[PDB]
Write a protein that binds this ligand. Structure first.
Ligand SMILES: CCCCCCCCCCCCCC(=O)O
Ligand SMILES: CCCCCCCCCCCCCC(=O)O
Ligand SMILES: CCCCCCCCCCCCCC(=O)O
Ligand SMILES: CCCCCCCCCCCCCC(=O)O
Ligand SMILES: CCCCCCCCCCCCCC(=O)O
Ligand SMILES: O=C(O)c1cc(I)cc(I)c1I
Ligand SMILES: O=C(O)c1cc(I)cc(I)c1I
Length: 581
């Protein structure tokens, strides 16, 4: 009878308020914080009214209606947001749709700066609620497409870091490494979110469904293809709605399928226990990040149903996709250690083959070498992992990063130096975060990270194209979007830059800089050094890097910094210029 009272009761006053806040923030991104805190109170006083009497006036209205109604209460709506106020003249079906429309994705607001640990902790003390609500409001208005409940999930992890660290003697050493982790986790989570909706739009349902099938069947290797199909179907509807940006429609669609999975739990996965015992607002998130189930191990084989058994072209022509979907389902679940793309890379190969064999005299003997063709497709990413995780051990994260720097700068020297550095730094991290895992969980790991990075890297070329090559892979299918980069070859067309002493003039500042800064500084010159002399051997370059490692010491450990950087520096650039000939 009352949508509001209902949401209140199973959500709770605490979470209800937080969400209302995030909600209004994602829409009225220009209104001040103190302004929303009022709305949230206004709205919460209301809800409480319905919980007491479901019949109380307006409690019968739909949330989409009540919401829109309040939004149109903002007097400065016309002045502040303008065009968006026009929405208030249409009635509900259109109105809400009209709001989702004029919702700015990335509004021009000032970069949020992280205050001093001590000022943070102190602010967290006098008024911890308003402290978090304000930063919640700040993050919200900056990412209006971000799933509220998930945003609320990060919020609490932040309060646990402030609760724990602001009590320690060494606050900074406690707080800082967590704030860095959370930041990088929310960034990753946001990018994937914006990444999923992009794929759904560029390649469409089929590709998305294929993807989902392989991933779903990897997690639930015991569920039957029928169930997987069901879920993959419901799933895609969810992401279509959530992408569209309607909070309520997306919140319910996710709640439903979460209930369906938990009720039919025993028919899906054994590792869904906990997730199903959690509250409404967390079940979904829980399930989505759930672990793989153990595989039947009583499994037959694939060459039996997909390479041998005549009547494959019969079963294939009857329902081309379901058949292929079965292949995936079948192959995926037997390989939780492959990357989803890898699997889609195989399914496609199979599709391609079936299409060039079911149209020949004796098909049975045309596609009997297929599996043999999966071999190279599998080993490429497998070799890449070992190779790169081996090197990451031979050198630290930092020393490893420099290897990539030199490696990629050579591929696309055209790319901006500050870009090559950042990109090269993130790749190193992916390497450290994943190489820690055993062979089994490696490939899936790399895929998770490499996916966002590669996209983030592509979105830039999107605004400032530089290389036709980087542009060729960025546009290609998500399934070829990675092996393409791995295929780039050192650019021989590139014409070396000209010397600029300034770029190789290091004044005694570096001596007093944080590791983050000392590196970025050194690394930036490294890229510049390769852009200048791109034909330097891994040998020639190692040398210059050595004569520079010592140099830094000899001048930031000597009684006359500044003189050492100018006198000794002239010797490096000179000697170096000559070494690299
Ligand atoms: C989200 C809820 C509010 C959490 C506040 C965290 C402190 C903000 C620090 C700035 C962001 C950063 O660079 O880490
Ligand atoms: C204002 C009312 C906001 C209602 C949002 C409910 C979202 C509940 C989370 C469900 C889920 O786990 O996906
Ligand atoms: C950075 C660490 C290097 C990891 C090797 C990249 C392998 C990615 C495999 C994913 C795929 O199959 O496309
Ligand atoms: C910016 C320059 C492009 C960077 C390419 C990243 C591709 C990482 C895949 C790993 C590899 O094959 O080396
Ligand atoms: C034209 C030659 C000028 C020499 C410029 C040297 C730039 C090398 C920076 C590389 C620093 C490597 C990092 C490190 O050693 O810790
Ligand atoms: O700017 C971002 O990329 C971003 C996104 C989310 I969602 C959470 C957090 I913290 C951040 I720093
Ligand atoms: O997209 C997901 O990560 C996902 C997966 C399953 I399985 C169930 C639900 I609800 C979700 I939101």
């Amino acid at each position: 009878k009352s949508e509001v009272a209902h949401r209140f009761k199973d959500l709770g006053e605490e979470n209800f308020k937080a969400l209302v806040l995030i909600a209004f923030a994602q829409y009225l991104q220009q209104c001040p914080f103190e302004d929303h805190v009022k709305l949230v109170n206004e709205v919460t006083e209301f809800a409480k009214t319905c919980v007491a009497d479901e019949s109380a006036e307006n409690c019968d209205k739909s949330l989409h209606t009540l919401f829109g109604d309040k939004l149109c209460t903002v007097a400065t709506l016309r002045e502040t947001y303008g065009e968006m106020a026009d929405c208030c003249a249409k009635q509900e079906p259109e109105r809400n749709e009209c709001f989702l429309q004029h919702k700015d994705d990335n509004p021009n607001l000032p970069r949020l700066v992280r205050p001093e640990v001590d000022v943070m902790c102190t602010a967290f003390h006098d008024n911890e609620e308003t402290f978090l609500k304000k930063y919640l409001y700040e993050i919200a208005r900056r990412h209006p497409y971000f799933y509220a409940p998930e945003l609320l999930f990060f919020a609490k992890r932040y309060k646990a870091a402030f609760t724990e660290c602001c009590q320690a003697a060494d606050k900074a050493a406690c707080l800082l490494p967590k704030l860095d982790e959370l930041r990088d986790e929310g960034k990753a989570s946001s990018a994937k979110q914006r990444l999923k909706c992009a794929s759904l739009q560029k390649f469409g349902e089929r590709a998305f469904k294929a993807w989902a099938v392989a991933r779903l069947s990897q997690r639930f290797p015991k569920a039957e293809f029928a169930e997987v199909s069901k879920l993959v179907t419901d799933l895609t509807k969810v992401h279509t709605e959530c992408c569209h940006g309607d909070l309520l429609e997306c919140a319910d669609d996710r709640a439903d399928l979460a209930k369906y999975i938990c009720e039919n739990q025993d028919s899906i996965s054994s590792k869904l226990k906990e997730c199903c015992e959690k509250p409404l607002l967390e079940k979904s998130h829980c399930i989505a990040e759930v672990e793989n189930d153990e595989m039947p191990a009583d499994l037959p084989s694939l060459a039996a149903d997909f390479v041998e058994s005549k009547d494959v072209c019969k079963n294939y022509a009857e329902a081309k996709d379901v058949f292929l979907g079965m292949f995936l389902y079948e192959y995926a679940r037997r390989h939780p250690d492959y990357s989803v793309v890898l699997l889609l890379r195989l399914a496609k190969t199979y599709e391609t083959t079936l299409e060039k064999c079911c149209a020949a005299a004796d098909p049975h003997e045309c596609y009997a070498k297929v599996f043999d063709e999966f071999k190279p497709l599998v080993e490429e990413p497998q070799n890449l992992i070992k190779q790169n995780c081996e090197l990451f051990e031979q050198l630290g994260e930092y020393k490893f990063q420099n290897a990539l720097l030199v490696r990629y700068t050579k591929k696309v020297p055209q790319v901006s130096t500050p870009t090559l550095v950042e990109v090269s730094r993130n790749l190193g991290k992916v390497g450290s975060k994943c190489c820690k895992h055993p062979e089994a969980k490696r490939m899936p790991c790399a895929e998770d990270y490499l996916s966002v990075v590669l996209n983030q890297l592509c979105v830039l070329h999107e605004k400032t194209p530089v290389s036709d090559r980087v542009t060729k892979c960025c546009t290609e299918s998500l399934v070829n979007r990675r092996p393409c980069f791995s295929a780039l070859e050192v650019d021989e067309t590139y014409v070396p830059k000209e010397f600029n002493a300034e770029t190789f003039t290091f004044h005694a500042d570096i001596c007093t800089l944080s590791e983050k800064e000392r590196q970025i500084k050194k690394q930036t010159a490294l890229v510049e050094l390769v852009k200048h002399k791109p034909k330097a051997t891994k040998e020639q370059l190692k040398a210059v890097m050595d004569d520079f490692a010592a140099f830094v010491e000899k001048c930031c450990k000597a009684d006359d910094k500044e003189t050492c950087f100018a006198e000794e520096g002239k010797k490096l650039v000179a000697a170096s210029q000559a070494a690299l000939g």
